[PDB]
Amino acid sequence: MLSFLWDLASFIVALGVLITVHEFGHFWVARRCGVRVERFSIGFGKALWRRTDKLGTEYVIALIPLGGYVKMLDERAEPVVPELRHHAFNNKSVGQRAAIIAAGPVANFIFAIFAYWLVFIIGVPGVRPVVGEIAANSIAAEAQIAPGTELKAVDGIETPDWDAVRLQLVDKIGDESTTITVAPFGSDQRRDVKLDLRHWAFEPDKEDPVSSLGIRPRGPQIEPVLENVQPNSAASKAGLQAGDRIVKVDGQPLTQWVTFVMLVRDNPGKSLALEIERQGSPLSLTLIPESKPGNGKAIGFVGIEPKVIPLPDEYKVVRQYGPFNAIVEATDKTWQLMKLTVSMLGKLITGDVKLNNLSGPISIAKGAGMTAELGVVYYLPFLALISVNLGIINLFPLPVLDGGHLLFLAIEKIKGGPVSERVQDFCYRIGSILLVLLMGLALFNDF
Numbered sequence: 001m002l003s004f005l006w007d008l009a010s011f012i013v014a015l016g017v018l019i020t021v022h023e024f025g026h027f028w029v030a031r032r033c034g035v036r037v038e039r040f041s042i043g044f045g046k047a048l049w050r051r052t053d054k055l056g057t058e059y060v061i062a063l064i065p066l067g068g069y070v071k072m073l074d075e076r077a078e079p080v081v082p083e084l085r086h087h088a089f090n091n092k093s094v095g096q097r098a099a100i101i102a103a104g105p106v107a108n109f110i111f112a113i114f115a116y117w118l119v120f121i122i123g124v125p126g127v128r129p130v131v132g133e134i135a136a137n138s139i140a141a142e143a144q145i146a147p148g149t150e151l152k153a154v155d156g157i158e159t160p161d162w163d164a165v166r167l168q169l170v171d172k173i174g175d176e177s178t179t180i181t182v183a184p185f186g187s188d189q190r191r192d193v194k195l196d197l198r199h200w201a202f203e204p205d206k207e208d209p210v211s212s213l214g215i216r217p218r219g220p221q222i223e224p225v226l227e228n229v230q231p232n233s234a235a236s237k238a239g240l241q242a243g244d245r246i247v248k249v250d251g252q253p254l255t256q257w258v259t260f261v262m263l264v265r266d267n268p269g270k271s272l273a274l275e276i277e278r279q280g281s282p283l284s285l286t287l288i289p290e291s292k293p294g295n296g297k298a299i300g301f302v303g304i305e306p307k308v309i310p311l312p313d314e315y316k317v318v319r320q321y322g323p324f325n326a327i328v329e330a331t332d333k334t335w336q337l338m339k340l341t342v343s344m345l346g347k348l349i350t351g352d353v354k355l356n357n358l359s360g361p362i363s364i365a366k367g368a369g370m371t372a373e374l375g376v377v378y379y380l381p382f383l384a385l386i387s388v389n390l391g392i393i394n395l396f397p398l399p400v401l402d403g404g405h406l407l408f409l410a411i412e413k414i415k416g417g418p419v420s421e422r423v424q425d426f427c428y429r430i431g432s433i434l435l436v437l438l439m440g441l442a443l444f445n446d447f
């Protein structure tokens with residue numbers, strides 16, 4: 001309960017913000033062009049929050065947060081006073097109406113710029129792309145890549161952190177090989193290696209592209225030391241205190257923490273003989289894991305948070321700039337994201353990216369919950385990414401979207417007159433049908 005509520009709240013706030021910024025771009029550019037905005041609907045369905053401005057503009061918050069619109073003044077929808085005729089949308093030039101229509105996606109892009117600028121002003125952390133472990137017989141193992149190597153670039157594009165590395169790796173789906181400029185950590189002697197991607201197969205929704213290459217990044221190391229023990233837990237009833245060191249679990253010494261994790265998760269109820277050390281004194285204990293609700297089966301909990309040692313700050317990057325520099329870098333980052341979304345849609349259409357791994361609203365909500373839990377410096381880039389996505393999928397040439405408006409408007413500009421009398425209407429309805437079908441298919445592949 002306490003988790004799903006946070007997820008839904010973060011999802012609703014993210015939606016609200018993005019809808020508001022798109023419709024605000026629409027409304028601002030429209031009002032500046034000289035037309036009169038009537039309704040500023042943020043959401044679909046029955047309205048809940050209606051307010052009226054002095055200029056007659058009605059701001060409306062509805063209940064279905066999966067969209068929104070801006071109702072313009074048009075002679076093709078209501079009878080207009082002879083003086084308000086030039087305040088109508090249809091009585092404007094093709095260029096003005098095209099700008100008013102394109103304002104929305106441009107508003108989303110500008111919101112992404114602003115989010116990344118605010119993040120750069122406040123600063124976003126990051127880890128250097130340094131390999132810690134290499135899985136044998138993998139993509140990177142066969143390319144003469146040794147542990148302790150700092151990735152410098154992917155196909156020439158700079159990769160200062162693991163995030164940019166994954167961002168460039170996902171852009172190589174469908175390719176048979178890729179080129180990575182690497183260097184040992186410390187020495188700036190660059191070297192171009194080539195990863196073979198012919199038999200490469202991974203789901204971007206389920207698999208980390210770094211691990212898909214058999215690469216583990218160097219991160220904070222978990223050590224078999226108890227940081228704190230929650231009260232009224234299995235470890236608390238087992239006699240474990242803060243600062244204890246798990247040495248032996250069921251006869252064999254404890255080498256990794258994932259071993260203890262799997263032993264607690266796959267063995268609920270059954271005892272575990274723990275030989276530990278407390279203040280240099282060896283002790284024996286019997287840990288009986290509980291059985292809290294899990295996914296797929298019954299998982300076991302003990303209430304132990306291990307002690308993690310963060311990797312040295314040598315593998316840390318601070319990405320904060322000054323105001324003007326932050327503006328420049330945010331523009332560059334959002335342009336990169338736009339080009340990457342273009343290439344990703346191209347990959348999905350060309351036939352090498354399955355549509356079943358698409359971002360579904362429940363997955364979007366879980367990601368929003370996780371990000372909002374992580375803080376603001378993570379929630380803002382998430383909002384910027386989803387804003388770029390929304391702005392770029394609405395500029396898609398389809399009758400009901402802003403892009404279809406721009407398309408029919410350009411055809412009117414060339415032809416000298418609106419495309420269709422009612423020949424459009426049968427596409428106006430079919431586009432809404434296709435949008436509802438796409439929404440349903442996206443919701444179903446998420447489930």
Ligand SMILES: CNC(=O)[C@H](Cc1ccccc1)NC(=O)[C@H](CC(C)C)[C@H](CSc1cccs1)C(=O)NO
Nearest residue numbers: 018019022026066067068069104394402435438439
């Ligand atoms: C989550 N909904 C969307 O992303 C749809 C397009 C879509 C539908 C289904 C699947 C994928 C994309 N876009 C919009 O709702 C735009 C609103 C922005 C702020 C998101 C909106 C589209 S117009 C209208 C459609 C129905 C009544 S009014 C717009 O352009 N206002 O200026």
Ligand SMILES: [Zn+2]
Nearest residue numbers: 083084086087
């Ligand atoms: Zn006037």
Ligand SMILES: [Zn+2]
Nearest residue numbers: 104105394402
């Ligand atoms: Zn729009």
